[PDB]
Amino acid sequence: KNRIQVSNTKKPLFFYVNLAKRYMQQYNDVELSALGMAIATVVTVTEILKNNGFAVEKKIMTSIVDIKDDARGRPVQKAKIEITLVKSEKFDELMAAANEEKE
């Protein structure tokens, strides 16, 4: 339920950042995974969330797994990253201070 898999090149970067912010607020943590050319997105989302102050990372892992590839006959290999983030202590404030609602 709190999993985001980046692949669709039609989506804007902020879709994922905001989708992660949601899942974090709703579920405390969030998972972010991506393959090959999509790892840049998850990398950038994490840098954004960490820097602006929303979250802290709990696990950051990149592996090389196999992928079913009917064209090549036998599976090819791709880099896959998996990043679990959890809400930071400043998250609630930020998800309000930007809206002038910070109590």
15 binds its own copies (CB under 8 A): yes
Q: Per the structure block, which two tokens stand in for 18?
A: 């905001």
Q: Whose Cβ is closer to K ion: residue 40's or residue 97's?
A: 97
User: How far is the C-alpha of 101 from the C-alpha of 88, rounded, in Å?
Assistant: 18
60 binds its own copies (CB under 8 A): yes
Cα radius of gyration (the chain): 16
100 binds K ion (CB under 5 A): no
Stretch that binds its own copies, among 23-31, 47-55, 88-96 (CB under 8 A): 47-55
Binding positions for K ion, rule: CB under 5 A? 101
